[PDB]
Amino acid sequence: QDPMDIKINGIKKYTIHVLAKVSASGMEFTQEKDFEHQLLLTDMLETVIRKSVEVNPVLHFHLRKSIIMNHSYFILGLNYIPPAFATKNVKSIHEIYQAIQDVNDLQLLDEFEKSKEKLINKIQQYKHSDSHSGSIRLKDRLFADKKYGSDRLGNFEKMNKITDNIIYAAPDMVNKICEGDGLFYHINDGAIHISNIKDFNYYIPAVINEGVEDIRTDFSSILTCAYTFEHVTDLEREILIPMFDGYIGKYGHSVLFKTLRLVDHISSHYDQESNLLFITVLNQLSTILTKIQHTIESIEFDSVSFSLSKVMFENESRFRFEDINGLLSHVIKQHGEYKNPESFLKAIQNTDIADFYRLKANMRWVGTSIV
């Protein structure tokens, strides 16, 4: 029996039910030496298990080794038709475990090459970006560890040298997925159920190289500036700073759009995993650099535009909650009362402009990458 039944009411009633398990790996994903091996075996397992489990009434089976705030987690997910609306009842969690343990090794070997090529392609496309690659190079130098940047989806050289003798580590992976301690999430009948109260302590990498300049020579330009914040609270990381990013580079007449329209393709994004706010803009970049810096240094706010950013960010959160997968991901990742979408929305509505000035005082520049 579960130790608790944390039922969150007031949830949108979906056409399907969801049963998820989140199993924690306390060690940081940078500390895991077999990171490329665990990723490949997990994808091989998911593909094989999916063929046996994704039958009626199960609509989708999910099994991934995911990173939540620089910590690895095994996340198993099951989307299924409710028994009242299904011709067949859904398997129990014990029967799902038994299917995972009944996976044949030849089935896994039959997926080895396809899963290896799949993950190899993800590593390349994640590193081979026109705009995101600048933020990847910054995170590599700012943190002095390529696991936070280029090797976030796995190192290419480590992943490409994997042979099919990885099959012998499959029992270790099956055991961790089935017997490792974890939390169960159950979405059904307009409610979210969590098996226990346990918030996994977040980890944010500290900047080791402060004031990074990526002087890079290449022919067709693009620039990317990185910023961080000190004394980041949960309210700032999950609400205030995402609001601040939309305020300055996303919500309509953003501060950067109006500022850079004087010169006359702007993008910004706050990375919660690294606590880094990036600003990417496509000779003329030299004036844009000083123009962006001075604008961020002399940033100001007002309550009317702040209230609009609260409304916009609430509706963006509401849109995520519309999707049952967006809702599940929110409840898994958030801490404490933020797991409740209503409490999360209420927290957005209760923000004030003094929060932005506290964030402005704790903001600083850490790096800049130009190609």
Binding site: K12, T15, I16, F85, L308, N315, E322
Partner: protein, 347 residues
């Protein structure tokens, strides 16, 4: 079980006349947002000069006010796009603001006056879009020369003929409040012109193959089924044929789009369909299960529900009639369309 689920969706799905337009309603309890969509019967095919897309840009203006800016200040994002036969105006918001946002949108859409400066300004914007799927995009945008041959009298006459309640379909998905004429009095802002007759100007390096063997819904089922079968056969055999779809709400028939260079390979696959006697029957059964699974999954997202309302006219048809059409697809329907596809390819 399965019967109670279809009844569950149909009790929340309704369509009724409001003023001189029609509103398709799908209520969702405890939804976080409500999707409202206003679809006007005019697209890139109604006029082959980019006129419908041009009107789409003009419809954002009324007495110097821009409705995107008005919606933005209200915390709502208005999105508009022109397809082959329709122009859509779609936005999300909390249900409390739906009535006022919808009536404000219809106020702009049923405004029929555009000064010369607004027309020339939007033409310059659209010319930049043209100078900045591809054929369909350029067919909808038109050319810089084509949109330069239309002026105020054309745009205002087209607005009065096509931007009317009778030529408008409204879709409101999510929430629980009904849409009525008292709250949206713009639903009676009619002109002297009724709903225009569905004239389709379909215009050299591709062929259009019709899928017409059954009712309106049946043609969608068969078109998707045959397109998916041909793609599957083209993978095992590594044919490099692209198979596009022309499935429009105002078309009783559905159509397959294939490159004129890839015709021989597509023709071989169509003739290859009837080889394995069990392939068609087993693929129909797999499609029926996949269609129901996707519908259950898609009926949680507001935009996906909207796609069912536009493609399958959900609202005019019930969900029971949708699955009834799906369950009625047999291998004889596939072989009948296979024969008409072969005869069309033969000549």
């Amino acid at each position: 079980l399965n019967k109670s689920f279809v009844k569950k969706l149909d009790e929340s799905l309704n369509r009724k006349q409001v003023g001189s337009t029609n509103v398709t309603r799908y209520k969702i309890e405890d939804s976080y947002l409500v999707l409202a969509a206003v679809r006007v019967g005019i697209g890139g095919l109604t006029y082959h000069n980019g006129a419908a897309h041009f009107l789409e840009h003009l419809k954002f203006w009324r007495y110097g006010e821009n409705i995107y800016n008005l919606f933005f200040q209200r915390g709502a994002i208005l999105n508009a796009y022109t397809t082959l036969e329709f122009t859509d105006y779609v936005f999300l918001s909390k249900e409390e603001s739906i009535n006022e946002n919808l009536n404000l949108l219809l106020t702009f859409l049923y405004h029929h006056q555009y000064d010369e400066k607004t027309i020339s300004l939007e033409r310059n914007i659209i010319i930049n879009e043209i100078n900045g799927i591809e054929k369909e995009r350029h067919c909808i945008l038109g050319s810089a020369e084509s949109i330069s041959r239309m002026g105020r009298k054309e745009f205002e006459l087209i607005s009065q003929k096509y931007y009317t309640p009778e030529n408008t379909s409204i879709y409101v998905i999510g929430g629980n409040q009904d849409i009525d004429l008292f709250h949206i009095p713009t639903a009676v802002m009619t002109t002297q012109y009724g709903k225009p007759t569905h004239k389709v100007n379909v215009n050299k390096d591709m062929i259009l193959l019709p899928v017409e063997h059954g009712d309106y819904l049946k043609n969608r089922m068969i078109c998707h089924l045959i397109a998916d079968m041909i793609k599957h056969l083209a993978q095992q055999l590594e044919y490099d044929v692209s198979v596009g779809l022309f499935i429009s709400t105002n078309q009783h028939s559905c159509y397959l789009k294939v490159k004129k260079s890839d015709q021989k390979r597509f023709s071989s696959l169509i003739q290859q369909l009837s080889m394995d006697e069990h392939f068609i029957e087993t693929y129909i059964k797999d499609y029926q299960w996949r269609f129901m699974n996707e519908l259950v999954i898609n009926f949680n997202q507001l935009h996906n529900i909207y796609d069912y309302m536009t493609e399958y006219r959900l609202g005019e048809y019930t969900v029971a009639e949708l699955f009834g059409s799906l369950d009625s697809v047999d291998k004889l329907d596939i072989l009948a369309v296979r024969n008409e596809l072969i005869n069309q390819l033969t000549v």
